[PDB]
């Protein structure tokens, strides 16, 4: 469960990201595709090279979904219900892959937030991304 301090920490860190949210989403995807090549099996129709239009567009959508989750942190199951239906019934991404994107989102934030990425904020962000991942896999069977 996310504590009051966890929610404060997540809102402060994502607030500092601000207008850079979309750029950071695309960078996290690129980091995932290079570090964990098995994740590329889900995008056989994409150009996956650095700077590709398809990766830029997808990164913006991922970022905007995270912004919505932060805004609705008290009730994420209801805020993310349509997105959890899409992953369970159509996309059918194996649940193991959500931890890989989560780690790459953390590494991206660490590389861009020298002052804000403290040990306490790191812990809270890891809990938050695990909770998002759990909602997105909750309807698979």
């Amino acid at each position: 469960v996310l504590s009051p301090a966890d929610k404060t920490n997540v809102k402060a860190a994502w607030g500092k990201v601000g207008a850079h949210a979309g750029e950071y989403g695309a960078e996290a995807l690129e980091r995932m595709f290079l570090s964990f090549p098995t994740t590329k099996t889900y995008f056989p129709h994409f150009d996956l090279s650095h700077g590709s239009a398809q990766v830029k567009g997808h990164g913006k959508k991922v970022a905007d979904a995270l912004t919505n989750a932060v805004a609705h942190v008290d009730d994420m199951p209801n805020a993310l219900s349509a997105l959890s239906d899409l992953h369970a019934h159509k996309l059918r991404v194996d649940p193991v892959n959500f931890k890989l994107l989560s780690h790459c989102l953390l590494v991206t934030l660490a590389a861009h937030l020298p002052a804000e990425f403290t040990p306490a904020v790191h812990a809270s962000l890891d809990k938050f991304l695990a909770s998002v991942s759990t909602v997105l896999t909750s309807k698979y069977r």
């Binding site: 098995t38 099996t41 194996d94 069977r141």
Partner: protein, 146 residues
């Protein structure tokens, strides 16, 4: 992986009693019932909408027999699994776009099918030898991914 002489004897003794046709069909069918997201690769196979539809589907049965036949051939090469499965690994990555976590899920279902069929004969030491084998085969099929 590396099996002991005792683990190798246990694997070969049990496999000589396996009906590869039946066990292959049963293992692929239970993968699609228990982890239903794995149906994503089998759009062309027809009705997969209930447990009985999946288990009795002729295309599911034929593909399970094919997959388990290749697994069977690999058991003659336990000290060289990565070399044995290299061409197949390449194919599953480049042509079929299959996430290798699927091979680990199939290995666990196969262990459950062998236990269900053999009962008390599938002892804790026999299971341990088969766990080493399915982990080795999954790792070999994952090895050429890029």
């Amino acid at each position: 992986v590396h099996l002991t002489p005792e683990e190798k004897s246990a694997v070969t003794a049990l496999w000589g009693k396996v009906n590869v046709d039946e066990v292959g069909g049963e293992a692929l069918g239970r993968l699609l019932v228990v982890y239903p997201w794995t149906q994503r690769f089998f759009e062309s196979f027809g009705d997969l909408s209930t447990p009985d539809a999946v288990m009795g589907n002729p295309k599911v049965k034929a593909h399970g027999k094919k997959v388990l036949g290749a697994f069977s051939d690999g058991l003659a090469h336990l000290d060289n699994l990565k070399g044995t499965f290299a061409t197949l690994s390449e194919l599953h990555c480049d042509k079929l776009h299959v996430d290798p976590e699927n091979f680990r899920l199939l290995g666990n279902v196969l262990v459950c099918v062998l236990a269900h069929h053999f009962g008390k004969e599938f002892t804790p030491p026999v299971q341990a030898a088969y766990q080493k084998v399915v982990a080795g085969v999954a790792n070999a099929l994952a090895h050429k991914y890029h």
